[model samples]
Target: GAMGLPNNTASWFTALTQHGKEDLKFPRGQGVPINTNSSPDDQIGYYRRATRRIRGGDGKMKDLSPRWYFYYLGTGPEAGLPYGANKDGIIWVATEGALNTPKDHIGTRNPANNAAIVLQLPQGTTLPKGFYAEGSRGGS
Candidate 1:
């Protein structure tokens, strides 16, 4: 933990396949160390997101703006998707003010006039990694 490394990985692929290590990679190839401390749900590398697509659509989103996929450290939930993105401690997060009020023209994080429940996540709901939208959609 905290860089000391070794947090259980099945004896690290059984000593890299009994010392017969192959090309194998992912020390930070797809990025998943996310924990920039952007807050929102900080605990051990915050990650409170809300998406509305699992098949490609909703670009006209009138809502669904709430993200915090920080980075700086990472995990190994069964080690899938090979981390993510540009890899490494993944320390980039954009969309100013978190993104035009979280997204959509003059939109906001709902809760007042409510109304923004747009959603999606229809395939193998990837967990802590391997891709996500969890359970295929909202209401986490």
Candidate 2:
């Protein structure tokens, strides 16, 4: 029931999600290094696809927006919520658009209609040092 940093140096992290009647599973994967051409201030960092679809209240797999949970890795002044309004000590994503800016663009990522979750860093121009985000989509 404990989590720690990986031995390998990495920038982006990935996760997977599964929906069911009584058991919704969300498991995180290993750290993934960002592209050499990528920087801390890029619009998006990485893309993760979910194999299964998201279930709605009716237990039907639909095009519902996926949820996100972010954790701060820094222990010094950098420790705290990465984005959103300052209120609670901890927080989930404010909304899908908070990071899924790609959905606003015109391309394959122009919609949240798929299982593509984006790791978007909008606050600062730093990677895991100052910020770290992990997001996952739903549905096949």
Candidate 3:
């Protein structure tokens, strides 16, 4: 199964929406191509060991529940339409999230660049379940 959005700026995520720990099978989707490898930090596409905790927007480690994780990836804006990578090749492994049960948690990491920052989404960002919109809507 696959899904895509316009502009190539959309964030694509695959989760164990059911329950229990399961390895992420699907890697490429829309404009996002996950970095699939078992090299500790660069392995954002899948997890060898279940993530127990993940950093949040506050830059603090938030405790997470067992057997849960979400892999996110996307490309930069500027492309027209969707369903493929952009001509400029602006893609990224945006962030990671977990069910966390009682409380939810989300964060980002790029080992190749030595970076780990919490995702700071705009206020009022809206979309249906299993999907999210990029950027913010403004008006006069």
Candidate 4:
């Protein structure tokens, strides 16, 4: 009954879904600090209202093709810390559009998807060893 919280939530969700899976590491730049005009128009209106996709009729496309906005910054010290402290190295932003351009406008040129993972914590901040470190998989 020690579920009072000491790890073991399904092995912390399988180590935060096998984060980096033994060095497959996939986070290069932009670990945080985003505000490009409003976080890519609110992640393209949250991927066009969570995948309703319906903008064709000669407008170009969108009969059903909009699922790429992936943003996942992380920190720790409580707040659904399953992957707790997961900073994935960093990847600030991505739109995925090239080779001549204009394919669904490629991430639409940013609009405030608002990403962050600073975590310096010193100026009066606490929680040094009071919690954090469940499986400690950030860069471990």
Q: Number of the top candidate by TM-score?
A: 2
The full ranking of all candidates by TM-score, starting with the best, is: 2, 3, 1, 4
Worst 10 residues of 2 by lDDT: 101-110
Candidate 1 local lDDT, 34-104, one digit each (tens): 22323322212212222333434744545433333322113343322221245332333222123211211
What is the Cα-based TM-score of model 1?
0.18
For lDDT, the strongest prediction is: 2
lDDT, candidate 3, 1-140, per-residue tens: 67764322212222222133332223332112233322223223221123356767887886543322333322233223133233232222222332112110122333444432222222333222332222223365
What's the lDDT for all of these models?
Answer: 0.26, 0.30, 0.28, 0.25
Please list the Cα RMSD from the true structure of every candidate, rounded to 1 decimal place: 19.0, 15.9, 17.7, 20.5
Candidate 3 least-lDDT 10 residues: 98-107
Off by over 4 Å in 4: 1-26, 30-33, 36-50, 53-62, 70-140
**What is the lDDT, from 0 to 100, of the residue 14 in candidate 2?**
40
What TM-scores do the predictions have?
Answer: 0.18, 0.19, 0.18, 0.17
Ranking, lDDT, top scorer first: 2, 3, 1, 4
Q: 1 or 2: which has the higher lDDT?
A: 2
Model 1 spans with C-alpha error above 4 angstroms: 1-107, 115-120, 129-140
TM-score of 3: 0.18
Per-model tally of clashing residue pairs: 11, 4, 0, 10
